[PDB]
Amino acid sequence: MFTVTVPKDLYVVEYGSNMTIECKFPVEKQLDLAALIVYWEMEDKNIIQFVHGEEDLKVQHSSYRQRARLLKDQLSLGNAALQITDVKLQDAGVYRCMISYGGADYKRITVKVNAPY
């Protein structure tokens, strides 16, 4: 059945680094962007809402504005890739990727941020 997978679901990151965290979803031949819905959230925070081919920024959390991006060129490979730039200690926690592409599924990713120098 349609399953979202996380071949890496643990990211131990240095403070102030950039990171890309990744969820896989099965794509047959050419991606239909109009059928795709990809959300990234963490705890009670909204990070990404990519809805039927277009990002919606209305409810995105202030802490993630300008730092959080979905890599659109990864979607056609069946890869939901969230880039966070300039990682903060408060970026530590459990992220979830929630995807509809015919089927519907989600997975959780653990992010740990090492203390700065």
Partner: protein, 116 residues
Amino acid sequence: EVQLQESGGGLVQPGGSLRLSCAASGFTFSSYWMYWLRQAPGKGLEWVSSINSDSSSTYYRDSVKGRFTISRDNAKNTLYLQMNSLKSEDTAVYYCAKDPGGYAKGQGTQVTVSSD
């Protein structure tokens, strides 16, 4: 905590109609895209329909286009699915969700379409 509760499920004959409702609380329902998902026994959870907060955009899985209509009342914090021309293949637990993965969804409402 997010609170979602579906209602309006039932047993119907092929060609029949149901109106599902979804009451929402514990978040600002009126801000969010909302989704109908469904899961039949032994099968994966699947996407049925999407609607944006202002009801300007609606989307439907190919198999329900022209039969199912999504709507919402942002004052009543309620999401609707009008299901007409129901088919045996529509049998499933129907879920309202505030995300397309079914992370945050209700306990569901059973829709059964069968001649018996």
